[PDB]
Amino acid sequence: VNELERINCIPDQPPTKATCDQRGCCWNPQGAVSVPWCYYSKNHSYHVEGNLVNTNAGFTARLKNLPSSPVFGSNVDNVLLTAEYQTSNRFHFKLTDQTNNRFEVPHEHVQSFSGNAAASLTYQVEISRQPFSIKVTRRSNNRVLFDSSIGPLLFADQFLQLSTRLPSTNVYGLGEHVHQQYRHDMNWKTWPIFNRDTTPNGNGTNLYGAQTFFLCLEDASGLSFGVFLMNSNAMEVVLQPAPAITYRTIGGILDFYVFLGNTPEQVVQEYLELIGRPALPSYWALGFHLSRYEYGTLDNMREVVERNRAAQLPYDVQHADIDYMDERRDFTYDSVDFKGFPEFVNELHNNGQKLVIIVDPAISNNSSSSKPYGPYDRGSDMKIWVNSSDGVTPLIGEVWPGQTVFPDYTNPNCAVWWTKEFELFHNQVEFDGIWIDMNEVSNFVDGSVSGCSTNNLNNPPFTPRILDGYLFCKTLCMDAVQHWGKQYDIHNLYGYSMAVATAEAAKTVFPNKRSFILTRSTFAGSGKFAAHWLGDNTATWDDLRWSIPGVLEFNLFGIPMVGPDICGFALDTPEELCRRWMQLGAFYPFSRNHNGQGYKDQDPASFGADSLLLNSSRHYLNIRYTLLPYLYTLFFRAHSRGDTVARPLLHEFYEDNSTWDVHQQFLWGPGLLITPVLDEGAEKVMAYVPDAVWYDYETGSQVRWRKQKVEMELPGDKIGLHLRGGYIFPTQQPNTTTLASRKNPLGLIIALDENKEAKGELFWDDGETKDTVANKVYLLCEFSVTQNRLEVNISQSTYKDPNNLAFNEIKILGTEEPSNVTVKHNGVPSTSPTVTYDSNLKVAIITDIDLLLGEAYTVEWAH
């Protein structure tokens, strides 16, 4: 056994030979740091009993436990392997107890399969019987992708483990964590996963959400695969330099999907086809959002709103945090400090802005005839709370308002209660979207106001390395009871079920509209319902750097609308850090400046009406808003096809191994390269320039750099932004709200490749109606340039914007002087455009044109 391939047999304590001998493992304390001293022998585990059986979907096998000493308790003697060839690119296998039903995740999107095995498989499955292992190989090159033979299968009631070899160390994903780097290096590292309210800091703890998906780029050809584990129990994932990854969970079943693609993007697409593609956002949610914990008063909030509006900051959304509430209780507002809240909502709406309100799941249980508290009274009438282990008494915990009960969102009746609370509240305060927080669920006491009984749920045989080392820390008792089952099994599904219920509420409160839901806690598939933010970060340079991998990973997880608290939630933000963070933050798919209680103001205009920070923030937000049609089209592709929005360089440039590690730059889709300064004091950044033609976004000048590391000069007022040759970017003149910007003239930026060609597309619908894609009420058009000619082609034509929108400007980068520009509509001229040319920069701008959105055109020129 190569020591890199040793699978640790003593995950639970300091290794000893006595424990090693008792567990029947191998002892060799002579390795390098972190190399396990005690590791599994070659026949710990299961063997296939008798023959495999073909089924319509695939095959089954019966696995029988080989005699072994019971470490983490009640072992499963007879295991059933069920394998389904679900599609040419997706394999599913699950290991269950042949004799007993066990907890299975009741996912809202994924359904059971009742097909026949797919034809033309891109993969092959090999089963070894003595001992059991499962291998999945890529058919084209026989690359072993999944191979459990490196380790045993362990399957006890509260301890399940399976390992797989990996074909490379280009491994991305898992969550929710602060990984600091984007590529997992595969050095010995254990990542615990158990939804927890905790600071995203440098400690690598489990955080708010649970995401078991990873993607592996196999080699420079782009061939990639992914693995998803459908299990909601506390678990950890162990990475080691074999390379290999081990999943170790403390309940449920091992239900695995393996996805193959020809590129990293195809793997994400296959994963999202399974778990659910992300919602198309309201176009206004793409704008800039501003927020803080504790304005304290409506007057204070108004003062902030007003100075940022006075500054002409692009600024669509204002969030109201728990300070709007009457004593931090949901579905109230403070009639003194927030007196006149409804009037302020009208002011926002009149200014073309939106209000997003925070709503917490925990509900104050303080109600009497003297002073009733409606949401509690109504929820109690409907009996929709999470109960204690007795199965009948609502569990009492403590959150913002004091003592609280917790809604059981797994109960469909709970969604009815919740919907009605929102309806009642929306009648008083006409908010536009909902920010659901503290939904891990977060509890200010451990378990309940009376703690947690000692039993195998609260105190299991094995505890993964979750923060604080007890499952019930800062959450509910594990033996609490909900419709879908015990908190031990469904804890990781709380925020997911809450997002589903809040989407259901939206159906009534915002009829036929998308609205906007922002959630803290997530499970696989949450992006179908909600955006995410990366939680309670801190105003440090490390937190700035750590945000980009967090954004990229959530795009892999199908939650493309993701971002951190720009400038940092905890602590007073230094001007220089906030200026850099706003520059980068103009390019997060979810762009929100948010701040914790009591800290110095960090809203952009608070730095001074003529400050470098405000000027730079306005500048780059104006660029963001200019590219909103491009961004919105990226979201359309994420929703319809499963593409990422914020995208690693390697997804586009996988042929170039210099991109495999890059985590300080990222792309919007295929075409826009973002290069922030991320180091204190720096007016430069060490940047990678991929193998493409690149143009400076502002000047349009072609950079000399190609496929090389560069020192990019970025003074205090700059972030790197370059456009990829071969791409056409739709734009729209910016305004301070998207309500207004959407009415503005459109533009095209055509970034020519080495062959003087480029292609692009534009999706356009009404920006807010639900089912616009499903019901085919949209415009989709395609742009292509191949010399001397731009074609605008209409592929879907079932929405016509009433605002007379047209492309009134075409900017061509990397071109020789165009002459005789002519515009044809369905073959007919047209009215001579104006052409301006910069021969030093090789940039042409065509103006005095009017190409109506949704009409086909050819624009031709000579040289």
Ligand X SMILES: *[C@@H]1O[C@H](CO)[C@@H](O)[C@H](O)[C@H]1NC(C)=O
Ligand Y SMILES: *[C@@H]1O[C@H](CO)[C@@H](O[C@@H]2O[C@H](CO)[C@@H](O)[C@H](O)[C@H]2NC(C)=O)[C@H](O)[C@H]1NC(C)=O
Ligand Z SMILES: O=S(=O)([O-])O[C@@H]([C@H](O)[C@@H](O)[C@H](O)CO)[C@H](O)C[S@+]1C[C@@H](O)[C@H](O)[C@H]1CO
Binding-site residues for acarbose, in ranges, read: 197, 321, 520, 536, 594
> Is 204 one of the binding residues for ligand X (CB under 6 A)?
no
User: Closest Cα to residue 163, out of 225, 248, 230?
Assistant: 248
Q: Under rule CB under 6 A, which residues in 346-405 are in contact with ligand Y?
A: 383, 387, 391-392
C-alpha distances (whole Å) from 485 to each of 252, 412, 521 are 11, 14, 19
Contacts of 3 (CB under 8 A, 6+ apart): 28, 31, 32, 35
Residue 456 sits at the vertex; the CA angle it makes with 437 and 452, to the nearest 5 degrees, is 50
User: Cβ closer to ligand Z: 84 or 197?
Assistant: 197
C-alpha–C-alpha distance, residues 105 and 119, integer Å? 28
User: Cβ closer to ligand Y: 486 or 619?
Assistant: 486
Give the total of residues touching ligand X (CB under 6 A). Answer: 8
Q: Which does 352 bind (CB under 5 to 8 A by kind): ligand X, ligand Y, ligand Z, none?
A: ligand X
Please list the active-site residues.
437, 440
- Return the residue of 408, 421, 432, 765 that touches ligand Y, per CB under 6 A: 408
Q: Which does 387 bind (CB under 5 to 8 A by kind): ligand Z, ligand Y, ligand X, none?
A: ligand Y
Helices (H) and strands (E) counted in the chain, each on its own, are: 14, 50
Taking each helix axis from N to C end, the angle separating 412-426 and 494-509, rounded to the nearest 10 degrees, works out to: 50
> Is 317 one of the binding residues for ligand Z (CB under 6 A)?
no
User: Cβ closer to ligand Z: 224 or 442?
Assistant: 442
Choices 195-203, 289-297, 439-447, 815-823; region in contact with ligand X by CB under 6 A? 195-203
Q: Which does 573 bind (CB under 5 to 8 A by kind): ligand Y, ligand Z, ligand X, none?
A: none
C-alpha–C-alpha distance, residues 469 and 757, integer Å? 57
Question: Which amino acid is present at 607?
Answer: F
User: Closest Cα to residue 269, out of 91, 431, 89, 412?
Assistant: 89
C-alpha–C-alpha distance, residues 809 and 61, integer Å? 64
User: Closest Cα to residue 812, out of 783, 777, 832?
Assistant: 783
User: Cβ closer to ligand X: 329 or 742?
Assistant: 742
Structure tokens at 212: 């078991």
What letters, b where the CB count within 10 A reaches 16 and e where it falls short, cover 382-408? eebbbbbbeeeebbbbebbbeebbbbb
Shortest CB 360 distance to ligand Z, Å: 7
> Is 701 one of the binding residues for ligand X (CB under 6 A)?
no
> Is 483 one of the binding residues for ligand Y (CB under 6 A)?
yes
Structure tokens at 99: 């004799």
> Is 197 one of the binding residues for ligand Y (CB under 6 A)?
no
Are 160 and 72 spatial neighbours (Cβ–Cβ below 8 Å)? no
Residue nearest to ligand X (CB): 202
> Is 29 one of the binding residues for ligand X (CB under 6 A)?
no
Q: Which does 740 bind (CB under 5 to 8 A by kind): ligand Z, ligand Y, ligand X, none?
A: ligand X
Pairing of strands 159-165, 154-156: antiparallel
Are 517 and 282 spatial neighbours (Cβ–Cβ below 8 Å)? no
Q: Which does 536 bind (CB under 5 to 8 A by kind): ligand Z, ligand X, ligand Y, none?
A: ligand Z
**Binding site residues, as ranges?**
197, 321, 520, 536, 594
- Return the residue of 334, 437, 643, 652 that touches ligand Z, per CB under 6 A: 437
* Cα atoms found within 13 Å of the Cα of residue 390, Cβ hemisphere only: 5
Angular region, 34: left φ>0, alpha ψ -120 to 50, beta rest: left
Neighbours of 820 (CB within 10 A): 11
> Is 543 one of the binding residues for ligand Z (CB under 6 A)?
no
Choices 146-154, 180-188, 201-209, 219-227; region in contact with ligand X by CB under 6 A? 201-209
User: Closest Cα to residue 409, out of 381, 440, 430, 431?
Assistant: 440
- Return the residue of 28, 86, 128, 199 that touches ligand Z, per CB under 6 A: 199
C-alpha–C-alpha distance, residues 527 and 597, integer Å? 28
Choices 268-276, 341-349, 733-741, 835-843; region in contact with ligand X by CB under 6 A? 733-741
> Is 536 one of the binding residues for ligand Z (CB under 6 A)?
yes
Contact pattern for ligand Y over residues 438 through 477, marking x by CB under 6 A: ----------------------------------------
- Return the residue of 740, 806, 845, 852 that touches ligand X, per CB under 6 A: 740
User: Cβ closer to ligand X: 200 or 725?
Assistant: 200
Are 642 and 273 spatial neighbours (Cβ–Cβ below 8 Å)? yes
Structure tokens at 236: 């950890």
Choices 163-171, 200-208, 689-697, 834-842; region in contact with ligand X by CB under 6 A? 200-208
C-alpha–C-alpha distance, residues 447 and 475, integer Å? 5
> Is 744 one of the binding residues for ligand X (CB under 6 A)?
yes
H/E segment holding residue 836: strand 834-838
> Is 312 one of the binding residues for ligand X (CB under 6 A)?
no
Structure tokens at 8: 């640790």
> Is 735 one of the binding residues for ligand X (CB under 6 A)?
yes
> Is 415 one of the binding residues for ligand Y (CB under 6 A)?
no
User: Cβ closer to ligand Y: 9 or 395?
Assistant: 395
Contact pattern for ligand X over residues 328 through 367, marking x by CB under 6 A: ------------------------x---------------
Question: Which amino acid is present at 285?
Answer: A
Q: Which does 392 bind (CB under 5 to 8 A by kind): ligand Y, ligand Z, ligand X, none?
A: ligand Y
The conformation of residue 136, written as its DSSP 8-state character, comes to: E
Structure tokens at 71: 């470490």
The conformation of residue 301, written as its DSSP 8-state character, comes to: H
> Is 197 one of the binding residues for ligand Z (CB under 6 A)?
yes
User: Closest Cα to residue 94, out of 235, 254, 228, 251?
Assistant: 254
Q: Which does 333 bind (CB under 5 to 8 A by kind): ligand X, ligand Y, ligand Z, none?
A: none
Q: Which does 437 bind (CB under 5 to 8 A by kind): ligand X, ligand Y, ligand Z, none?
A: ligand Z
Are 153 and 249 spatial neighbours (Cβ–Cβ below 8 Å)? no
User: Cβ closer to ligand Y: 381 or 610?
Assistant: 381
- Return the residue of 215, 229, 481, 751 that touches ligand Y, per CB under 6 A: 481
Site for ligand Y, rule CB under 6 A: 383, 387, 391-392, 408, 481-483
Q: Write out the residues near ligand X by the rule CB under 6 A.
A: 201-203, 352, 733, 735, 740, 744
